[PDB]
Amino acid sequence: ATKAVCVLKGDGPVQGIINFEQKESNGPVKVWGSIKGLTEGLHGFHVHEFGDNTAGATSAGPHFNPLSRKHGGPKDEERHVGDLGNVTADKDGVADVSIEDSVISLSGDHCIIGRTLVVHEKADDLGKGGNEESTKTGNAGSRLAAGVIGIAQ
Amino acid sequence: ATKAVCVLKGDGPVQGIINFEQKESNGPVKVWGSIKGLTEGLHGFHVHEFGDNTAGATSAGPHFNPLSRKHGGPKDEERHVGDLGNVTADKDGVADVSIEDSVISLSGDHCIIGRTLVVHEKADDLGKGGNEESTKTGNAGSRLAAGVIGIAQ
Ligand SMILES: [Zn+2]
Ligand SMILES: [Zn+2]
């Protein structure tokens, strides 16, 4: 099994640890962990193209998109590889993350290791927002916390 | 061609940005950038196995060593892949890093993307210390700052 980990940090109180595990190279990736300091409700959750945190989360560039698709939700055929949708924060501001995804990988062409995981200000509209920015970012607002996805033991 | 970048941070004053560039896959990786907050003199400079920053630099594991060799200097045949030797801080505590290495890579089995770059408390003895620890770590002392090596534009 391949394993990866991401420590999410930013300028505010938002912080968390996200784990990735992929049992076989042609099988799904399990993604799980916890993020605290968030407002109650939905928050965009994306893999961005670059593992560059030199100017914070901004230098991570756009959503990881090697097939040159439009933005969508994780269940959509039309999506970026990095489109993992929304995480939900409870009343205390904790988002317990538990996702399975078959588009991202921890090896080969859709490998997300060395790229940036980002958690956003507000809801990802999943490409249904009806403006240009819906097709690109999902209108999920500023980047609250980010980290480079690294190889784990 | 392929580029990577690493933001070095720790609990102390050591901070820096290190760039990686490899123009061809069968070819040397240029490593450069500035690290500040160091004590004047030599500091061990290594790629460690895991891109796991959950417990700081400590969770990064040992030197990246896919060929199960003993620790050495960058010029040695007997070395870990991650053995980049020393960097030198000047009298103002700044290490203007400029290294070229043909053993690390930004692709294939010796790929360092998604692993951790670490700068150490003191000099790497390059495996010439005459104790067991010299052939494991180079007696470079504590891990002062670390970062996950991410894919850059
Ligand atoms: Zn997207
Ligand atoms: Zn070593």
DSSP-assigned states of every residue in B55-121: EEEGGG-SB--TT-PPP--TT-SSS-TTEEEEEEE-TTS-EEEEEEESSSBSSSTTB-TTSEEEEES
Token representation of residue A92: 């205390």
A147 touching chain B per CB within 8 A: yes
Resolution of the solved structure (Å): 2.0
Q: What residue of B is the nearest CA neighbor of A56?
A: B7
Nearest CA among A137, A134, A120 for reference residue A63: A137
Q: How was this structure determined?
A: X-ray
Nearest CA among A128, A108, A85, A98 for reference residue A21: A98
Cα dihedral across residues A77, A83, A89, A94: positive or negative: positive
Q: Residue A5: enclosing H or E segment and its boundaries?
A: strand A2-8
Mutation target vs A (from B52, B59, B104, B109; most A CBs, 10 A cutoff): B52
- List the domain range (segments joined by +) for residue A3: 1-153
Nearest to B114 among A17, A113, A153 (CB): A113
Total domains present in chain A: 1
